[PDB]
Design a protein around this ligand. Sequence first.
Ligand code: MET
Length: 235
Amino acid sequence: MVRVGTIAGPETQLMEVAKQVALNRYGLHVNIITFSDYNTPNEALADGSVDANMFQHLPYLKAQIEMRGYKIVSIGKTFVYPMGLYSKKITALTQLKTGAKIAVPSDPSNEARALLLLEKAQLIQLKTHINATPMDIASNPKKLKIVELDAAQLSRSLGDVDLAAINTNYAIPAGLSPSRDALLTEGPNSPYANVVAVREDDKNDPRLKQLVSALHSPAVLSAAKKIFGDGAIPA
Ligand code: MET
C-alpha cells in the first residue's frame, strides 16, 4: 500500500478522512505514518520510509532541500493555514510594552514568515525588497525582543512571552483557535499553502496523484471545516 507521512495532530485527523475516501472511492490503501517534528517527514520520504508526505509548505520544502539535498517535489496543494499571532497577556496589539518579547519559529522559512506577519501587524518593518531574519528588521519602534523557538515549543511559551506567532497545526492542540483567539492572522493568498510531496522519481505515480485528489474531495473539505473552521482554506 501507500505510506503517507503526517505530523501528529489535527492534520493527521484530516489525513484519516482522506484515507477513508482513498479506500472507499479510489480503492486505494493508505497507511498513515505520523511524525513529531517538521524536520523528519522529508528524511522519511527521501529514505523510502514513506511514499509521500503532507505537512509542509513550498518555502519549507525549498529550504530543507537546500540544507539536505533531497530530491523531492510537490505534486499538489492541499490547504493554506493562515498563521496567527497569539497571546495570554494582551488582547490587543497596541498593548505591547517597550521591550516586549515576541516568540517566532526558529526554522528559516517559518521564521521569515512570522517576521512578515509582525510587519503586517505594523510592529516592525523589514529592509526593503521569504528569507527574512531579525537582522533584516529595519524599524523596531517598541524595541521588541524576538525569541526564536522550535515550532513545537511555541504554544507552551505564552506564559513567558507577550506574543507568539504559532503554526495552526500546533495552535489547535493547545486550545488556540486562529479564528477565535488570534489577535491577527495572515491573509489567505500567501505562499504558504501546504503540499503533498513525493520523491522526484515518483512524481507521475497515479496512486500518489490520487492521494492529492482525495484531499480535495467533498468529504475532506467538510472535515477540514470541522477540524480547522476558517483556519483552513482549500488550495
Ligand atoms: C512545515 S512548514 C509549516 C506547515 C504548517 N502546517 C503550516 O501551514 O503553517
